Design an enzyme around this catalytic site. Structure first.
Site, PDB file in Angstrom:
ATOM      1  N   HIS A   1      -0.336 -16.058 -10.410  1.00  0.00           N
ATOM      2  CA  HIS A   1      -1.396 -15.974 -11.411  1.00  0.00           C
ATOM      3  C   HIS A   1      -1.749 -17.359 -11.980  1.00  0.00           C
ATOM      4  O   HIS A   1      -2.918 -17.769 -11.987  1.00  0.00           O
ATOM      5  CB  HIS A   1      -0.915 -15.014 -12.514  1.00  0.00           C
ATOM      6  CG  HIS A   1      -1.778 -14.983 -13.734  1.00  0.00           C
ATOM      7  ND1 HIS A   1      -2.315 -13.815 -14.227  1.00  0.00           N
ATOM      8  CD2 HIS A   1      -2.191 -15.968 -14.567  1.00  0.00           C
ATOM      9  CE1 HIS A   1      -3.027 -14.079 -15.309  1.00  0.00           C
ATOM     10  NE2 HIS A   1      -2.969 -15.379 -15.536  1.00  0.00           N
ATOM     11  N   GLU A   2      -0.744 -18.088 -12.454  1.00  0.00           N
ATOM     12  CA  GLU A   2      -1.023 -19.404 -13.044  1.00  0.00           C
ATOM     13  C   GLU A   2      -1.674 -20.333 -12.024  1.00  0.00           C
ATOM     14  O   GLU A   2      -2.579 -21.094 -12.348  1.00  0.00           O
ATOM     15  CB  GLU A   2       0.265 -20.006 -13.608  1.00  0.00           C
ATOM     16  CG  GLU A   2       0.846 -19.183 -14.747  1.00  0.00           C
ATOM     17  CD  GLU A   2      -0.157 -18.932 -15.858  1.00  0.00           C
ATOM     18  OE1 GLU A   2      -1.087 -19.718 -16.021  1.00  0.00           O
ATOM     19  OE2 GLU A   2      -0.016 -17.943 -16.584  1.00  0.00           O
TER      20      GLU A   2
ATOM     21  N   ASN B   1     -12.051   2.764  11.274  1.00  0.00           N
ATOM     22  CA  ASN B   1     -13.317   2.119  10.942  1.00  0.00           C
ATOM     23  C   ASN B   1     -14.175   2.230  12.200  1.00  0.00           C
ATOM     24  O   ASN B   1     -13.866   3.030  13.057  1.00  0.00           O
ATOM     25  CB  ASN B   1     -13.070   0.655  10.582  1.00  0.00           C
ATOM     26  CG  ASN B   1     -12.087   0.002  11.518  1.00  0.00           C
ATOM     27  OD1 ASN B   1     -12.223   0.107  12.739  1.00  0.00           O
ATOM     28  ND2 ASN B   1     -11.083  -0.673  10.957  1.00  0.00           N
TER      29      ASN B   1
ATOM     30  N   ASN C   1      -9.836   2.221  17.213  1.00  0.00           N
ATOM     31  CA  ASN C   1      -8.562   2.200  16.497  1.00  0.00           C
ATOM     32  C   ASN C   1      -7.459   2.968  17.209  1.00  0.00           C
ATOM     33  O   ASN C   1      -7.720   3.933  17.915  1.00  0.00           O
ATOM     34  CB  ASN C   1      -8.705   2.893  15.136  1.00  0.00           C
ATOM     35  CG  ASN C   1      -9.814   2.334  14.299  1.00  0.00           C
ATOM     36  OD1 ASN C   1     -10.654   3.085  13.813  1.00  0.00           O
ATOM     37  ND2 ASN C   1      -9.818   1.008  14.095  1.00  0.00           N
TER      38      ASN C   1
ATOM     39  N   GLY D   1       0.033   9.199  13.659  1.00  0.00           N
ATOM     40  CA  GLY D   1       0.432   9.976  12.506  1.00  0.00           C
ATOM     41  C   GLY D   1       1.871   9.880  12.051  1.00  0.00           C
ATOM     42  O   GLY D   1       2.111   9.630  10.860  1.00  0.00           O
ATOM     43  N   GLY D   2       2.815  10.044  12.976  1.00  0.00           N
ATOM     44  CA  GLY D   2       4.228  10.019  12.634  1.00  0.00           C
ATOM     45  C   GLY D   2       4.667  11.466  12.475  1.00  0.00           C
ATOM     46  O   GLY D   2       3.896  12.351  12.819  1.00  0.00           O
ATOM     47  N   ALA D   3       5.873  11.739  11.978  1.00  0.00           N
ATOM     48  CA  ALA D   3       6.289  13.131  11.799  1.00  0.00           C
ATOM     49  C   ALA D   3       5.412  13.658  10.674  1.00  0.00           C
ATOM     50  O   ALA D   3       4.598  12.916  10.132  1.00  0.00           O
ATOM     51  CB  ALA D   3       7.765  13.210  11.408  1.00  0.00           C
TER      52      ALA D   3
ATOM     53  N   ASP E   1      -0.344  15.437   9.725  1.00  0.00           N
ATOM     54  CA  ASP E   1      -1.353  14.447   9.404  1.00  0.00           C
ATOM     55  C   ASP E   1      -2.774  14.849   9.702  1.00  0.00           C
ATOM     56  O   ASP E   1      -3.019  15.761  10.488  1.00  0.00           O
ATOM     57  CB  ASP E   1      -1.016  13.180  10.155  1.00  0.00           C
ATOM     58  CG  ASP E   1       0.407  12.790   9.941  1.00  0.00           C
ATOM     59  OD1 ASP E   1       0.780  12.675   8.756  1.00  0.00           O
ATOM     60  OD2 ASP E   1       1.155  12.637  10.927  1.00  0.00           O
TER      61      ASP E   1
ATOM     62  N   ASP F   1     -12.858   9.353  22.335  1.00  0.00           N
ATOM     63  CA  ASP F   1     -11.558   9.215  21.711  1.00  0.00           C
ATOM     64  C   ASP F   1     -10.610   9.880  22.693  1.00  0.00           C
ATOM     65  O   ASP F   1     -11.026  10.701  23.506  1.00  0.00           O
ATOM     66  CB  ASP F   1     -11.476  10.056  20.447  1.00  0.00           C
ATOM     67  CG  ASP F   1     -11.957   9.342  19.226  1.00  0.00           C
ATOM     68  OD1 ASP F   1     -12.559   8.258  19.344  1.00  0.00           O
ATOM     69  OD2 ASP F   1     -11.722   9.898  18.144  1.00  0.00           O
TER      70      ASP F   1
HETATM   71 CA   LIG Z   1     -12.644   4.021  15.039  1.00  0.00          CA
HETATM   72 CA   LIG Z   2       2.918  11.310   9.082  1.00  0.00          CA
HETATM   73 CA   LIG Z   3       2.260  14.204  12.761  1.00  0.00          CA
HETATM   74 CA   LIG Z   4     -14.078   7.446  17.462  1.00  0.00          CA
END
Ligand SMILES: [Ca+2]
Ligand SMILES: [Ca+2]
Ligand SMILES: [Ca+2]
Ligand SMILES: [Ca+2]
Ligand SMILES: [Ca+2]
Ligand SMILES: [Ca+2]
Length: 452
Positions: A165-166, A330, A334, A338-340, A343, A377
């Site tokens: 900050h400073e 976006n 991309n 998701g992961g477990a 999602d 996709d």
């Molecule tokens: Ca995209």
């Molecule tokens: Ca997840």
């Molecule tokens: Ca998942």
């Molecule tokens: Ca797409």
């Protein structure tokens, strides 16, 4: 209407929207409006070479006239303070065309900074001067038995943020407004979720970073700070211009961009000069909401509004954690994992590669252009009966007509499988007799896996 899954994505994509509306009874300022607000003094170091080159010194002795400042006992920065200061300096140098080199003032430099401590409380916790003042480049830090914050700065604590900050102040950033409280702020986003220059807690804007009794402060420039310093000195496009991973398995080489444990409290704004980048939040178990939109905010590691991507930065990939996350891409292609957990993944435009991970995942599409035959996709681990391809934002729940061949009727759809374990969903939304929407998958997709 649309499904709850689409609504969740849409709501999150707009959750932190800024500008042209009131929030907390104050005008919401966009990042650019804040960049103007934070640089309203007109003070800055001047170049030229296109880069501002500053030298800085950790004073070893009180300067001439020091005693008249009423700061009490002078003291040199400890090794720990110098180490943290250098990290703070680097975090600013990373985003804007300014460099800091330890050394005495030099004829070839564009200015000189000093760092030192004082012991008399009457000085304040810390302070600095704008670059157009007679004490340009100076920042001072209180250290005494009653105020120990500046003695042990470290990633995530207020001591480190104070240094950041400073220094922001020595660079020409003013505090967001002129006992004051957030009530006196000029705009809604005057909190430390947006800028380390703010005196007010993120709680005022609704974000949650930590709880009572614990501290949690961004160690590096936040979203608005980056826009502000870049407005002053230009964006530094050279930093991390190669492929970079931020978060877990970080390759950013910055303490504030690294996560190694599920309890880590990340508060940062990503600045990058290019490269195929990834936000890896795989190590968190809490629900997260990751937005790859430039200039947008994400809810990460069990906190909210704590991660953002600086304006002008394109981040390509995101990896969620074990919680039930939302992932928003976006326009670029991309890779979203998701992961477990369950999602909701929204690729956006471009040809995305989506990984649902274990659990039951929903792949949301909000426009036909999201996934076209020429830029489809691909869902790499689609699990029929568990996952879902959601087109409700497009069909508005009107439904689809699953056929084996397009009939020329709008809404006709074809689910195919090739025993390369590759499936596909083609759709003729416009009714031209051909597919104008295509999504391919690894793993079979059935008509019952589609929400439309
Ligand atoms: Ca995209
Ligand atoms: Ca997840
Ligand atoms: Ca998942
Ligand atoms: Ca797409
Ligand atoms: Ca990069
Ligand atoms: Ca990139």
């Amino acid at each position: 209407g649309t499904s709850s899954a689409f609504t969740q994505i849409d709501n999150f994509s707009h959750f932190y929207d800024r500008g042209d509306h009131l929030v907390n009874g104050k005008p919401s300022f966009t990042v650019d409006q804040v960049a103007d607000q934070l640089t309203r003094s007109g003070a800055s170091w001047h170049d030229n070479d296109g880069v501002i080159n500053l030298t800085y010194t950790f004073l070893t002795a009180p300067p001439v006239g020091y005693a008249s400042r009423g700061l009490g006992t002078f003291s040199q920065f400890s090794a720990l303070q110098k180490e943290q200061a250098k990290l703070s300096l680097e975090s600013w140098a990373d985003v804007a065309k300014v460099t800091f080199t330890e050394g005495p003032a030099a004829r070839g430099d564009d200015g000189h900074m000093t760092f030192a401590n004082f012991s008399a409380s009457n000085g304040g916790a810390a302070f600095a001067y704008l670059p157009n003042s007679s004490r340009k480049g100076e920042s001072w830090y209180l250290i005494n038995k009653d105020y120990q914050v500046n003695k042990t700065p470290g990633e995530g604590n207020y001591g480190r943020q104070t240094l950041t900050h400073e220094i922001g102040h020595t660079l020409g950033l003013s505090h967001p407004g002129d006992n004051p409280t957030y009530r006196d702020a000029v705009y809604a986003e005057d909190t430390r979720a947006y800028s380390v220059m703010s005196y007010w807690s993120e709680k005022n804007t609704g974000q949650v970073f930590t709880k009572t009794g614990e501290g949690a402060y961004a160690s590096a420039p936040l979203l608005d700070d980056i826009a502000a310093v870049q407005k002053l000195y230009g964006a530094n496009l050279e930093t991390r211009a190669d492929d970079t991973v931020y978060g877990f398995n970080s390759t950013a080489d910055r303490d504030f961009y690294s996560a190694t444990s599920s309890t880590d409290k990340l508060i940062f704004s990503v600045w990058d000069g290019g490269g195929n980048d990834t936000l890896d939040f795989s190590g968190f178990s809490q629900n997260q909401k990751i937005n790859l939109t430039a200039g947008s905010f994400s809810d990460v590691g069990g906190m909210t509004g704590n991660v953002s991507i600086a304006q002008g930065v394109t981040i390509e990939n995101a990896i969620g954690g074990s919680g039930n996350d939302l992932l928003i891409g976006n326009d670029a292609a991309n890779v979203l994992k998701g992961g477990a957990g369950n999602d909701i993944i929204y690729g956006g435009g471009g040809a995305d590669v989506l990984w649902g991970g274990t659990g039951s995942d929903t792949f949301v599409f909000g426009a036909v252009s999201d996934s076209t035959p020429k830029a489809a996709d691909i869902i790499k681990d689609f699990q029929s009966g568990f996952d879902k391809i959601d087109l409700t934002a497009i069909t508005k729940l009107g439904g689809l007509n699953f056929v084996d061949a397009f009939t020329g009727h709008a809404g006709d759809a074809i689910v195919s499988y090739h025993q390369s374990n590759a499936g596909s969903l083609q759709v003729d939304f416009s009714g031209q007799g051909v597919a104008d929407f295509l999504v391919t998958t690894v793993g079979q997709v059935a008509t019952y896996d589609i929400v439309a």
